[PDB]
Design an enzyme around this catalytic site. Structure first.
Site, PDB file in Angstrom:
ATOM      1  N   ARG A 176       1.368  -2.249   1.848  1.00 28.60           N
ATOM      2  CA  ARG A 176       2.111  -1.022   1.586  1.00 28.60           C
ATOM      3  C   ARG A 176       2.892  -0.575   2.811  1.00 28.60           C
ATOM      4  N   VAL A 177       2.224  -0.505   3.962  1.00 29.35           N
ATOM      5  CA  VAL A 177       2.850   0.028   5.165  1.00 29.35           C
ATOM      6  C   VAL A 177       3.705  -1.011   5.875  1.00 29.35           C
TER       7      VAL A 177
END
Ligand SMILES: Nc1ncnc2c1ncn2[C@@H]1O[C@H](COP(=O)(O)OP(=O)(O)OP(=O)(O)O)[C@@H](O)[C@H]1O
Ligand SMILES: [Mg+2]
Lengths: 114, 50, 49, 57, 189, 117, 171, 114
Positions: G27-28
């Site tokens: 995600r990051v």
């Protein structure tokens, strides 16, 4: 291929592949007959029969029954023998020559006996 | 991380929690050990920012 | 048969010359590969020490 | 007799004409592939020697 | 929920056994069909040879050798299986038949359907396309009698009766074990 | 000697050598023995074929609308369906010969002719 | 913030690391990845997931469109490219070059059986002879246009002098 | 229908009908594939897959993950698009054309792209 030698891994994986193909062809053999196979499949089935029966050994635990002294096959000898088998260098021997023998010396002796 | 697949498809940034999830003997401790080993090129720089 | 002969002779000669070029480039690349592997061997020996 | 012989000669001539032109490219490609193979063998054996010296050292 | 899962496990096991049996039976019948294909090759080769000789001696004016001056109708014989469980066989054949229909319409011809196999009949019935005549029950094991009947019908339709100014056959070439390909051959003119 | 290949559209029925062949083409009966000129001739709808094998008695074959052909290397008989005389059912041939259809009657009459009628 | 899902089915059949590209995600990431990696591997995850989906369809379909075959070949070569030994972590620039080989199609001419060896040999050649590419990638974190052109030239030059396992040229 | 209108309700419920019929076939799809289904159901499965993928959209919050800018589809356009799609007016386009495309204009653009 790190803990055991690279040659050991290659031989073991080739033997496993051959036996897996042979077990896949079991269904065709037991129903359609051995004749239905192709030439390549027939060759591989003979080779797999010999490899699979060559994994047998005259275990020391059987010495009490047959009197034949058990066999300890060094790792190098097993690796070389199965490298030969997967390469088909012993495909011309009878299947019975591979039953309960430890190593290439016993293989040759039993071949001569038959 | 030093692994092509992870550094390319699923990059891990500093400050991230990246869950290495998988069955037994699927190479989970060989992905985290490789990540630790790959940090030596940064460690020898002597720069606390790296 | 004269030209085809000339073309075949030229092809053989050019192939030999460009094969010499290929082998020279490959020998240089082999030398650089050997140098890199020897440098890596030195670095690994240093780290082991 | 000579007329027939000449017919035959010109025939084999144009035969070689197509042939030798084909064989020129065939042999050029053959020698080029052999040169690439020798180059690859040289690089591979040099890499093997480098890894051998790595192992030995 | 566990009862449903166990029932589905039993059902899937039964389906697995049936499908494996079908696979092995199909493996046997592939060899049988290939042997039968090879058995007919000598007749085809010899009849082609003597047909070539006769054409060398013939006038080459037979209707099967000359195009109709304004072609309108082009019969299409779509060969399809009469039973399911054949994957994309029928789908491939019918897609190629649709390609042939589009090609014919782009050239100004009107396709008229002759069909072999129940699956093709179903596919064409769903799409509101009528079939002049259709045969069934021999795609698994054809005999020369069925081929004779089909050929007689097609040839008579070509000689005509509304008739057809062309005729194609769309069927699956058995190039190899791993590959089969839907093809269309103009069987006349 | 002749190399006679009798080929059904389904299979290569017979390919043995022969010394002589006899059959009724639509334009007349023909007897072929080796080195005959190249030939191609439609057989009568009810025709039957005789092949005089170099060994035992000649084979008689019921043939359904076959095409005979001859070339220096072989003698072909390309048939929709061919039956050895031993394989002919007399009652079936009799019933077919009485059939109204021209094809069925012709096939029955061919089978009867091959059988020995 | 993301999971690298290692699958036993892929691990036991030689694909190591067994990253399940379909489920695995970060995600990051993307912001943390260096610019060169984001450029070369921009669509690598989606491409590999699509190839894994397509493999099931093509495993039994007799034939497929040209796009399907192209995707299947590209995905097979990418999978062989991402396959990596253990205790052999590649630096980021080496990863950039290795991924550039595959995502830009340079591997399309190399057979599947030799993608690994081709990548390893080319990395060795680039370190030994054209380290300027690695130096640029490391120093400016970007695969500049001149560096990209030089790398393409080096790849084309190397493919002339490379053998497939079948002996055929890979040009 | 009293709140969102008759057309919106009809399109939504036809989409739900197609998707539910597709769900009912999941075991048969999984085992034998779409080939075994009847034509009335095979066409439905094709347009069900297309509806399912067309319900995907390139969300603006998804830019940071994929890089494509996010698209916004007005209600009238989606109602018309799904009315057209359920009726089969787009069942000739490939599935990927509808995937993460977010609208009819973008649908045609990506269909051209493929
Ligand atoms: N990239 C790789 N290439 C080849 N072998 C690998 C690779 N990664 C891991 N392995 C092998 O996988 C074996 C088992 O993997 P590993 O120990 O990393 O798994 P794990 O998830 O930590 O397992 P567990 O906790 O169940 O013991 C290791 O012995 C190593 O030989
Ligand atoms: Mg562990």
């Amino acid at each position: 291929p790190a803990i055991v030698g690279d040659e050991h891994y290659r031989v073991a994986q080739e033997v496993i592949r051959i036996l897996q193909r042979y077990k896949d062809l079991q269904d065709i053999i037991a129903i359609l007959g051995i004749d239905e196979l192709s030439e390549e499949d027939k060759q591989l089935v003979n080779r797999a029969r010999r490899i699979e029966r060559f994994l047998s050994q005259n275990m020391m635990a059987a010495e009490q029954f047959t009197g034949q002294p058990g066999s300890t096959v060094p790792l190098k000898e097993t690796i070389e023998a199965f490298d030969k088998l997967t390469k088909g260098e012993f495909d011309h021997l009878p299947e019975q020559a591979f039953f309960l023998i430890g190593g290439l010396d016993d293989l040759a002796k039993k071949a001569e006996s038959l | 991380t030093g692994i092509k697949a992870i550094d390319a498809m699923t990059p891990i940034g500093r400050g991230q929690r990246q869950l290495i999830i998988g069955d037994r003997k699927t190479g989970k401790t060989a992905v985290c050990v490789d990540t630790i080993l790959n940090q030596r090129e940064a460690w020898l720089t002597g720069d606390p920012k790296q | 048969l004269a030209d085809a002969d000339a073309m075949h002779a030229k092809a053989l000669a050019d192939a030999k010359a460009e094969s010499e070029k290929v082998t020279e480039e490959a020998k240089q690349d082999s030398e650089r590969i050997a140098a890199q592997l020897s440098e890596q061997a030195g670095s690994e020996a240093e780290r082991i020490k | 007799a000579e007329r027939e012989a000449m017919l035959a000669k010109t025939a084999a001539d144009n035969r070689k004409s197509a042939e030798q032109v084909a064989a020129a490219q065939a042999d050029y490609e053959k020698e080029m592939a052999e040169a690439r193979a020798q180059a690859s063998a040289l690089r591979d054996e040099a890499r093997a020697a480098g890894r051998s010296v790595v192992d030995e050292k | 929920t566990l009862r449903e899962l166990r029932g589905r496990i039993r059902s899937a096991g039964s389906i697995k056994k049936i499908t494996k049996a079908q696979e092995l039976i199909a493996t046997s019948r592939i060899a049988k069909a290939q042997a039968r294909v090879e058995a007919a090759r000598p007749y085809a080769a010899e009849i082609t040879n003597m047909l070539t000789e006769l054409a060398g001696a013939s006038a080459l004016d037979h209707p099967l050798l000359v195009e109709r001056k304004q072609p309108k109708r082009a019969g299409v014989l779509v060969v399809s299986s009469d039973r399911g469980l054949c994957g994309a066989y029928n789908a491939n054949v019918l897609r190629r038949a649709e390609e042939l229909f589009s090609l014919l319409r782009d050239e100004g011809k009107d396709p008229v359907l002759y069909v072999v196999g129940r699956k093709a009949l179903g596919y064409f019935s769903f799409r509101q396309r009528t079939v002049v005549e259709s045969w069934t029950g021999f795609s698994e094991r054809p005999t020369y009698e069925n081929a004779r009947e089909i050929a007689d019908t097609l040839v008579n339709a070509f000689m005509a009766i509304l008739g057809v100014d062309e005729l194609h056959i769309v069927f699956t070439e058995f190039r190899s074990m791993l590959s089969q390909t839907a093809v269309a051959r103009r069987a006349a003119p | 000697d002749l190399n006679v290949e009798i080929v059904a559209v389904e299979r290569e029925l017979w390919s043995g050598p022969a010394t002589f062949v006899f059959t009724r083409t639509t334009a007349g009966e023909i007897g072929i023995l080796p080195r005959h000129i190249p030939l191609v001739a439609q057989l009568v709808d009810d025709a039957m074929v005789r092949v005089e094998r170099e060994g035992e008695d000649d084979l008689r074959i019921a043939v359904d609308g076959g095409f005979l052909s001859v070339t220096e290397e072989t003698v072909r008989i390309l048939v929709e369906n061919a039956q050895f005389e031993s394989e002919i059912d007399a009652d079936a041939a009799k019933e077919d010969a009485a059939s109204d259809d021209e094809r069925t009657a012709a096939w029955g009459r061919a089978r009867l002719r091959a059988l020995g009628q | 913030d993301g999971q690298c899902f290692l699958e036993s089915d892929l691990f036991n059949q030689g694909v190591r690391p067994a990253i399940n590209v379909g489920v695995s995600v970060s995600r990051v990431g993307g912001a943390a990845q260096i610019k060169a990696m984001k450029e070369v591997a921009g669509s690598l995850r989606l491409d590999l997931s699509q190839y894994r989906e397509l493999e099931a369809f093509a495993a039994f379909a007799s034939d497929l469109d040209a796009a399907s075959k192209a995707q299947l070949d590209r995905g097979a070569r990418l999978v062989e490219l991402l396959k990596q030994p253990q205790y052999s972590p590649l630096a980021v620039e080496e990863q950039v070059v290795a991924i550039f080989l595959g995502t830009q199609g340079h591997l399309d001419s190399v057979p599947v059986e030799d993608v690994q060896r081709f990548e390893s040999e080319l990395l060795e050649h680039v370190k030994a002879s054209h380290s300027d590419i690695f130096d640029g990638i490391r120093e400016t974190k970007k695969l500049s246009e001149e560096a990209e052109e030089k790398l393409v030239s080096v790849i084309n030059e190397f493919k002339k002098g490379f053998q497939a396992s079948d002996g055929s040229s890979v040009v």
